[PDB]
């Protein structure tokens, strides 16, 4: 599936933008984050899926409803963002 879609439609837009900051990180700043890291995108697209906290701050992005290869597609998008 196409990311752009899935950004609006899993809800990721009600917490995250690509340049500011809202509930969650920037895209932006979270591909600076990971810039060319070895492994990232896995290991983004298990955070999508299953949850995440501490990295950004200390509140929780809760757990997705997403599927292995929606999360896959996701988080290829984000790393794309720099
Ligand atoms: C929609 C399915 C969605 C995506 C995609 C997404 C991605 C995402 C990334 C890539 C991160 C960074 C994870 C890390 O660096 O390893 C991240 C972080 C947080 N998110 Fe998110 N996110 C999506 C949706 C949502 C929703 C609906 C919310 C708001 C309820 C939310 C929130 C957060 C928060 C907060 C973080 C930071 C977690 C941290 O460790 O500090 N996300 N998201």
Known sequence: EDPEVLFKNKGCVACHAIDTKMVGPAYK????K???????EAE???????????????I?????????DEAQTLAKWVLSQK
Do not use: E, H, T, Y
């Not at 700043?29 to 600076?32: H, R, S, T, Y």
């Not at 983004?44 to 200390?58: C, E, F, M, T, Y």
């Open 29 to 32: 700043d979270v591909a600076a």
């Open 60 to 68: 929780p992005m809760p757990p997705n409803a997403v599927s292995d």
């Open 44 to 58: 983004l697209a298990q955070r999508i899926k299953n949850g995440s906290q501490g990295v950004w701050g200390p």
């Open 34 to 40: 990971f810039a060319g890291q070895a492994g990232a």
